[PDB]
Amino acid sequence: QAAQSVDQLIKARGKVYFGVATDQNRLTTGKNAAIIQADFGQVTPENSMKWDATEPSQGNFNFAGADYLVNWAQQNGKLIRGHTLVWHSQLPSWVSSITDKNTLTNVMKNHITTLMTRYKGKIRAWDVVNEAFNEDGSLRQTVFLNVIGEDYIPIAFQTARAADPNAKLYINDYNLDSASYPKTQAIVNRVKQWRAAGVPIDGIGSQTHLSAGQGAGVLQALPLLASAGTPEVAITELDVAGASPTDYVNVVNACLNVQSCVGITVWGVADPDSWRASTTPLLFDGNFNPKPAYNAIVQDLQ
Ligand SMILES: O[C@@H]1[C@@H](O)[C@H](O[C@@H]2CO[C@@H](O)[C@H](O)[C@H]2O)OC[C@H]1O
Numbered sequence: 001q002a003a004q005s006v007d008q009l010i011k012a013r014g015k016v017y018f019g020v021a022t023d024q025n026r027l028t029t030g031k032n033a034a035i036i037q038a039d040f041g042q043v044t045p046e047n048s049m050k051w052d053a054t055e056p057s058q059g060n061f062n063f064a065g066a067d068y069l070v071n072w073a074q075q076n077g078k079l080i081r082g083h084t085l086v087w088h089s090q091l092p093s094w095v096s097s098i099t100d101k102n103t104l105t106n107v108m109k110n111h112i113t114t115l116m117t118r119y120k121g122k123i124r125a126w127d128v129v130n131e132a133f134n135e136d137g138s139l140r141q142t143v144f145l146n147v148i149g150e151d152y153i154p155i156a157f158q159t160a161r162a163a164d165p166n167a168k169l170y171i172n173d174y175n176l177d178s179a180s181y182p183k184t185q186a187i188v189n190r191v192k193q194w195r196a197a198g199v200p201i202d203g204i205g206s207q208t209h210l211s212a213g214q215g216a217g218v219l220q221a222l223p224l225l226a227s228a229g230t231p232e233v234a235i236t237e238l239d240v241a242g243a244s245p246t247d248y249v250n251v252v253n254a255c256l257n258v259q260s261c262v263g264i265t266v267w268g269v270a271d272p273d274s275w276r277a278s279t280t281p282l283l284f285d286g287n288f289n290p291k292p293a294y295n296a297i298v299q300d301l302q
């Protein structure tokens with residue numbers, strides 16, 4: 001645990017939170033629980049709420065890991081971001097084997113409804129749809145798009161809002177780090193069109209999985225993302241190859257510059273536990289000590 005809390009400091013700047021991804025296996029080992037307790041104010045289940053973990057068989061739900069995280073979060077007063085409802089990855093084979101429009105639609109709705117009602121009122125935001133865009137801005141051809149068509153997105157969001165009107169509904173994606181990139185512009189145009197049609201998209205989530213030097217691009221990309229008109233936008237799965245303080249400060253400043261940016265979520269605590277460990281992209285090293293990037297963010301926020 002570090003002496004200065006980036007979450008407390010970001011709160012003093014007028015933002016809602018600075019959080020991290022985690023799960024039961026992380027919370028019960030290392031110094032993870034201590035660091036999240038003292039330095040962060042929000043958590044996102046890294047894997048316990050995905051489709052493969054929660055509904056391995058149709059109608060046969062498993063909330064073990066998910067229940068653990070929510071309970072731990074409430075007890076410690078940490079905000080929660082549900083992650084993630086509709087995604088083509090980590091999807092049970094029984095889902096992708098469905099070729100009937102009606103069936104897949106009801107199945108997708110049942111999945112969304114069940115997960116969201118179980119935690120009704122306890123989740124700040126949900127990543128309803130994850131990675132729905134191709135790099136060129138076109139909609140990714142997944143089983144949902146193929147079987148249901150474009151309407152699967154409006155349906156998912158409409159169903160989510162019905163399940164828990166208290167949560168902020170987000171569409172989440174990566175590679176939205178440059179204002180000139182086609183994907184970035186496309187999501188802004190698509191969200192604008194959807195909202196104009198009454199689809200309840202409260203926020204755009206920007207994963208922000210960066211490589212060295214890409215932090216500078218976010219200074220322009222976030223404001224562009226914000227121009228879609230959504231109530232909120234957020235940095236949802238931040239990590240930077242090399243963990244340079246320059247890149248990290250740039251992403252934080254980008255959020256401080258955009259009024260609709262509610263907060264930032266870093267994808268993990270310690271480097272070795274990162275899904276990109278080989279690039280030591282996190283704010284804490286293997287010894288669970290804060291890295292220069294952590295101290296630079298703190299100095300920047302104070
Ligand atoms: O639309 C709302 C924004 O007006 C709000 O903006 C915050 C206001 O306080 C400032 O200190 C913060 O920097 C800024 O983000 O954010 C929430 C949103 O709902």
Ligand SMILES: O[C@@H]1[C@@H](O)[C@H](O[C@@H]2CO[C@@H](O)[C@H](O)[C@H]2O)OC[C@H]1O
Binds near residue numbers: 047131207267275
């Ligand atoms: O522990 C790993 C997770 O960190 C990883 O999380 C995904 C990373 O890519 C993002 O686009 C997704 O939103 C996020 O869920 O998933 C694999 C797991 O092994």
Ligand SMILES: O[C@@H]1[C@@H](O)[C@H](O)OC[C@H]1O
Binds near residue numbers: 024048053065066
């Ligand atoms: O069961 C939990 C699992 O769902 C999560 O993905 O990782 C931690 C485990 O304890």
Ligand SMILES: O[C@@H]1[C@@H](O)[C@H](O)OC[C@H]1O
Binds near residue numbers: 089131174207209
């Ligand atoms: O698998 C995806 C990966 O390609 C991207 O870089 O980050 C998000 C992940 O979901």
